[PDB]
């Protein structure tokens, strides 16, 4: 039920256009998410969707949280992921409906939230590279004893799909050439409209450029460095569509310095 708030075009439209000054969006998210579930899983009756959303709001309030990605990712991480012998592993009974979640919501944000608010055993070293798998001793014994066998593994592209988003960030304009060449074909014209009806190549560049600036802006919060004192200029998320903001009439950039040589990678 929480996958809608993390994968829905209609919320993105109501968040990529409305300014950051006002804070109260509890109504505008509730109305939007029901449209989001309407266009994603229409087989759900309204009252089931109404109550399930009402419980979600009520469940958050009892924990003294505020509705947002920092709080929603908490709920999913504790609902699905639990520590085990191998570290963070998905619980076996809930695995099947987790796989449904992966079709709409990426795993990278979820695993990060679980580590922060529920660390591993004795702070044991853990670098995340592979998607989480449920642990069952019977299968684990068989796999180690007799290895798996793959028969259809498309080599080209990326190792998985979540990292291809990172590769897309490395080419904010070159990936548009793939988009523009594909957009000439009628098949890609319909497929793009299937997800969001108002999807145009400039919007695709709009969102990718916006996603690029958000990564840098929030990185400065993670690194601990103080805010670059041009955020006061930006109050509308659309202003992040040009990789440069104008505050007191001078050029102010968004790109920051990262400790890693390759700032665009899984780690």
């Amino acid at each position: 039920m929480e996958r809608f708030l993390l994968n829905s075009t209609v919320l993105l439209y109501r968040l990529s256009t409305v300014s950051l000054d006002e804070v109260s969006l509890d109504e505008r998210v509730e109305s939007s998410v029901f449209l989001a579930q309407y266009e994603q899983a229409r087989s759900l009756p309204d009252h089931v969707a109404k109550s399930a959303w009402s419980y979600l709001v009520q469940q958050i309030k009892q924990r003294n949280m505020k509705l947002g990605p920092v709080a929603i990712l908490r709920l999913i991480a504790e609902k699905f992921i639990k520590n085990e012998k191998g570290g963070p592993k998905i619980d076996l009974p809930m695995f099947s409906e987790w796989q449904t979640l992966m079709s709409r919501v990426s795993c990278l944000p979820i695993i990060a939230c679980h580590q922060v608010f529920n660390p591993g055993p004795a702070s044991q070293e853990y670098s995340f590279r592979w998607p989480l798998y449920p642990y069952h001793p019977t299968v684990e014994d068989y796999i180690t004893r007799e290895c798996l066998h793959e028969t259809h593994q498309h080599l080209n592209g990326s190792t998985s799909a979540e990292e291809c988003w990172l590769d897309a960030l490395k080419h904010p304009e070159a990936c548009l050439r793939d988009f523009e060449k594909g957009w000439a074909s009628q098949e890609m014209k319909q497929l793009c409209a299937q997800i969001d009806p108002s999807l145009t190549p400039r919007i695709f560049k709009d969102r990718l450029q916006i996603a690029c600036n958000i990564r840098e802006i929030l990185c400065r919060v993670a690194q601990g460095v103080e805010l670059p004192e041009w955020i006061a200029s930006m109050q509308n998320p659309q202003q992040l569509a040009n990789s440069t903001i104008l505050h007191n009439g001078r050029e102010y950039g968004f790109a920051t310095v990262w400790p890693i040589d390759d700032k665009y990678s899984q780690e």
């Binding site: 990262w258 400790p259 890693i260």
Partner: protein, 80 residues
């Protein structure tokens, strides 16, 4: 005052070590190495899981581990 402008040939200064503001019996090495090991690993922690992090950290750990035998060799009750 000396160390304030000195932080600006590149030099680094450990925070001042006062034996009075310390346990009465702890020798100098364990105190100074605690200061020394704190930043140098924190400087490594400044990096985020880079390739050079693992090489420098593990070789640093061996340096401390091989010196742990003599950390007890700063006098004792009786030899064993």
């Amino acid at each position: 005052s000396v160390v304030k402008s000195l932080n600006s040939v590149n030099i680094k200064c450990l925070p001042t070590i006062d034996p009075t503001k310390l346990p009465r019996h702890e020798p100098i090495l364990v105190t100074v190495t605690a200061r020394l090991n704190k930043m140098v690993s924190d400087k490594l922690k400044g990096y985020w899981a880079s390739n050079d992090y693992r090489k420098q950290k593990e070789q640093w750990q061996n340096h401390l581990a091989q010196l742990q035998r003599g950390l007890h060799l700063l006098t004792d009750k009786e030899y064993k």
